[PDB]
Amino acid sequence: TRALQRAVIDKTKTPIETRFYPLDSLRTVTPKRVADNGHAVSGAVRDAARRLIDESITAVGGSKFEVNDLAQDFRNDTPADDAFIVGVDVDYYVTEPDVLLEHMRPVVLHTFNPKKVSGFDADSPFTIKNNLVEYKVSGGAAWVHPVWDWCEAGEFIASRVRTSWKEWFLQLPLRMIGLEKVGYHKIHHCRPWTDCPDRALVYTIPQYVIWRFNWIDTELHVRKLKRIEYQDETKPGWNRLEYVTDKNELLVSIGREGEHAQITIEKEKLDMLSGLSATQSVNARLIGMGHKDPQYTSMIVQYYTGKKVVSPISPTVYKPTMPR
Amino acid sequence: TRALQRAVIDKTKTPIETRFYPLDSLRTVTPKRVADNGHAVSGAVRDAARRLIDESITAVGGSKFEVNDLAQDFRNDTPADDAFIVGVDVDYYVTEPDVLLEHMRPVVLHTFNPKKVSGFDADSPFTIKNNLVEYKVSGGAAWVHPVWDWCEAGEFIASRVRTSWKEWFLQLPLRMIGLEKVGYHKIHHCRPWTDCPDRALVYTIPQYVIWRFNWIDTELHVRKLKRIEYQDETKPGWNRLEYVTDKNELLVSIGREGEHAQITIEKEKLDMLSGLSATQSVNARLIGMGHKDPQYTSMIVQYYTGKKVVSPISPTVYKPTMPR
Amino acid sequence: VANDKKPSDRIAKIAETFVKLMNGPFKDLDPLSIEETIERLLFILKVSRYTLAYSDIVLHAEHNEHWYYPGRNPTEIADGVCEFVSDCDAEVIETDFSNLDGRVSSWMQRNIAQKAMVQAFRPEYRDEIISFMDTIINTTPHNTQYNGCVEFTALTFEHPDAEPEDLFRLIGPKCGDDGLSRAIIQKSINRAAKCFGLELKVERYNPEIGLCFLSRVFVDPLATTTTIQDPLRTLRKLHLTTRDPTIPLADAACDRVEGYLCTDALTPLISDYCKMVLRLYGPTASTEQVRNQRRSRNKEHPQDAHLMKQVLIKRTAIDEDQVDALIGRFAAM
Incomplete structure (x- = not known):
């Protein structure tokens, strides 16, 4: 329509680049196993992530502003303009990723983006209820936070930008109409640790700012970060997750909310099984495929029938921490 | 909200540190087996704990104030300010851990924090009814006391502080409003004996005091010690317990209240089994896994169906004590 | 043979402390102009323009002379070696690396070279230096x-309880x-080498x-500074000449023996060979101006003579009577 022409013509962009040196070291880093034997600890994973980011930043020679809610309150530290923003396990701390992206500066972020719907991340048990991850840090408190969908398709993002109260007064009449000052970013996530596949090393570069119309679509269909909806609308009380394997396999993870048991299966198998008429047929087919483990077939059958169980909340005793 | 700003700004803390030397000896102590052969006796475990704490304190060169209800009545002994507070099996004696934590001094405490819902602790039978542990000391009387949740996630605690009657008069109008004088502590629990995994060697250091608002939440979600609720709200008459193993396993312990039989199972298995439609299916799956012991599968089935049995109270004959 | 053996977590702090001590008081630097680099001392020039300046500024500073011997005259090298051996009372160890540029x-x-270069040079030159380092990854200063x-x-690793500055102040002479x-x-x-890989x-x-x-033999570093090739x-390879085939054998031998005279005039078992080469290939060689105008020309203390002789015999494990027989055979040929 002619409205599309308005958006196409109205570029009015102001590209800004404070010579942010591309951090090619973070991009294209081979998978690594931090723990020589056994399984790594959460503190060890955090230390490895910090060391990797530190080495990259120092090798490039840039500066950094580590964050350890709506405003970062960077004034108390006043870092340089060219310095990067680095955050580790700050999902609980930051209300939104927009808080980090308003600064219109490159962001290096190590986050929790699970590929299993429940289980252990390193030594830290975690579980998803409603749509909030009930993470339990090994040697720490209990974190309750959502996941902000870093790994969905699309490299271009829309985010807010910093605005003062005077700027707020200036733009509020324009804001209510549907006019927003939107910055654009390019995302890269690496997934660098094999033993802990639930944590992603997100990397981001800003590209340029733009004024956009709220009630007008975009030709490139740029997306803005949204909270993930783990709940399965077809089977109440169940969480469903899909992810793509490196060997060209589209697996799916199923499980109940506020619950520990979890199984991964090829998506095609789940779609075939979800249409079977009888419960006994599910077991017959699963035995046909060669799955003899009861823990697998029983969970598949329970998902097929949508069995809801009100599991209780019970006291937990956590592993003793050792500084080493 | 703006109320959150009030709490954030209102630090008004008065850190106090009477050069309490960190007891690094207690932290990071490898597991030990007190009894060379057979199983250790409760008195032997108590002696070992006392010896370990004594050696640590003397090596650090500090002093101690051993406790053997609301007020410790330390005036009769007037220990030094720098001396530590040490208690062994004082769960029955002390009404609350707040009694120990009001002194705003480091606490070394050896407590009963079971990981089995019932059975034997060393040679002492113990059982949980309602929410009180019916401990039966080997060579002693019968102790009835709750558990005060030392091992939950979170290293920071809230506790009362000593206040005189004049201080009570001063702070009562403020206290009723919702203003409390709260101290903060850092916890470490070690679990040092393998043959007696139900006893934990709790260690504590105070950090600083603060004035807090009762009806305002805390950003860090600091927790205050609460009585454990062993009762399972889903299956009346049953006690459920969860704990994390060193080998990355989340086991669960189930059993009836005022009852002796007890079994530990992986949590995932229990969640899978709790959703099965038929009782015979539980046995079928359990045989599939390879569990041939009737004492295990029968208890699992009873938990699944929530079978309640009114076991009687009967006379008991205890083992004769020998001073050796 | 490329290797990707990352070091341990603990070693990273040691490496960072070493890099900071290398930085010292020279926070800021500037690149050299092309003309100045050309008159200093294609592909070599683009990296040299920065690396020569970096070496001259940081590696040749007051607080970095304890270890960076590389970059001084041979007389200065001998003086430094004698001073170091006098300080260590003849208690020193030698390090010999195999294909360091092929094994780093x-x-x-x-984390060492790139960090040092970026810290030494000005921020406005960061992109050029980082690009040059990236090209290098996929000369002298690196070693x-x-x-x-x-x-x-x-x-x-030897003294983990001492301050890093005091630890680094003990760094002895190092040259590639x-x-x-x-x-x-x-x-x-x-x-330590296993930890780094x-x-x-x-x-x-x-x-x-x-x-x-440095392929140099100190006959008696305790007292004298006399040194030889x-x-x-x-010795096991001096009889064979590795010059290109286009050069006549006489010119290559003459250049080799001229260098040997310039460095090893009074060394036993080499002076006789050099003199016999000069006697045999000398007259048969071409004009020396011709070889001075030819590219392949650059492609090559009397008091302790007894001690130098004995030290050479010990080095070559040849009996004194056997040494005399060999010397007689060489001279009479």
Whole structure:
């Protein structure tokens, strides 16, 4: 329509680049196993992530502003303009990723983006209820936070930008109409640790700012970060997750909310099984495929029938921490 | 909200540190087996704990104030300010851990924090009814006391502080409003004996005091010690317990209240089994896994169906004590 | 043979401390102009323009003269070696690396050399230097930086309780693939090399066989500074000439013996060979101006003469009567 022409013509962009040196070291880093034997600890994973980011930043020679809610309150530290923003396990701390992206500066972020719907991340048990991850840090408190969908398709993002109260007064009449000052970013996530596949090393570069119309679509269909909806609308009380394997396999993870048991299966198998008429047929087919483990077939059958169980909340005793 | 700003700004803390030397000896102590052969006796475990704490304190060169209800009545002994507070099996004696934590001094405490819902602790039978542990000391009387949740996630605690009657008069109008004088502590629990995994060697250091608002939440979600609720709200008459193993396993312990039989199972298995439609299916799956012991599968089935049995109270004959 | 053996977590702090001590008081630097680089001392020029300035500024500073011997005249090298051996009371160890440029790992390259260059040079030149380092990853200063890093790692492992500045102040002379260190870390050096992923060869100092350093043999470093070409490396191969086929044998031999006279005039078992080459190939060689105008020309203390003779005999494990017989045979040919 002619409205599309308005958006196409109205570029009015102001590209800004404070010579942010591309951090090619973070991009294209081979998978690594931090723990020589056994399984790594959460503190060890955090230390490895910090060391990797530190080495990259120092090798490039840039500066950094580590964050350890709506405003970062960077004034108390006043870092340089060219310095990067680095955050580790700050999902609980930051209300939104927009808080980090308003600064219109490159962001290096190590986050929790699970590929299993429940289980252990390193030594830290975690579980998803409603749509909030009930993470339990090994040697720490209990974190309750959502996941902000870093790994969905699309490299271009829309985010807010910093605005003062005077700027707020200036733009509020324009804001209510549907006019927003939107910055654009390019995302890269690496997934660098094999033993802990639930944590992603997100990397981001800003590209340029733009004024956009709220009630007008975009030709490139740029997306803005949204909270993930783990709940399965077809089977109440169940969480469903899909992810793509490196060997060209589209697996799916199923499980109940506020619950520990979890199984991964090829998506095609789940779609075939979800249409079977009888419960006994599910077991017959699963035995046909060669799955003899009861823990697998029983969970598949329970998902097929949508069995809801009100599991209780019970006291937990956590592993003793050792500084080493 | 703006109320959150009030709490954030209102630090008004008065850190106090009477050069309490960190007891690094207690932290990071490898597991030990007190009894060379057979199983250790409760008195032997108590002696070992006392010896370990004594050696640590003397090596650090500090002093101690051993406790053997609301007020410790330390005036009769007037220990030094720098001396530590040490208690062994004082769960029955002390009404609350707040009694120990009001002194705003480091606490070394050896407590009963079971990981089995019932059975034997060393040679002492113990059982949980309602929410009180019916401990039966080997060579002693019968102790009835709750558990005060030392091992939950979170290293920071809230506790009362000593206040005189004049201080009570001063702070009562403020206290009723919702203003409390709260101290903060850092916890470490070690679990040092393998043959007696139900006893934990709790260690504590105070950090600083603060004035807090009762009806305002805390950003860090600091927790205050609460009585454990062993009762399972889903299956009346049953006690459920969860704990994390060193080998990355989340086991669960189930059993009836005022009852002796007890079994530990992986949590995932229990969640899978709790959703099965038929009782015979539980046995079928359990045989599939390879569990041939009737004492295990029968208890699992009873938990699944929530079978309640009114076991009687009967006379008991205890083992004769020998001073050796 | 490329390697990607990243170091351990603990070693990273040691490497960062060593890099900071290398930085010292020279926070800011500027690149050199093309003309100045050209008159200093294609593909070599683009990296040299920055690396020569970086070396001259930082590596030749007051607080970095303790270890960066590479970059001084041979008389200065001899003086430094004699001073170091006098300080260590003839208790020194030698390091011999095999294909260091072919064995340095990516982590070492990007956390020692790149870090040092970026800290030394101005921020406005960061992109150029980082691009040059990236091109390098996929000359002289790199070997010195690696040797300094390994020395710092050894010193940190030996005395973990001392301050990093005091630890680094003890760094002995180092020059590329060759260097000197205290003998007290002879066994611990292998473990440090294994942690970084490098291969190290170490030999205890022995006065009977002399000391090996920069292919130079110190006959008696305790008293005299007299030094000679390494006999072990050259004697077994001096009879064969590795010059290109286009050069006549006479010109190559004449250049070799001229260099030997310039460096090893009074060394036993080499002076006779050089004189016999000059006597035989000399007259048959071409004009010396012709070879001075030819590209392949550059492609090559009397008081302790007795002691030098005995030290050479010990180095070559040849009996004195056998040495005399060999000398007589060489002269009479």
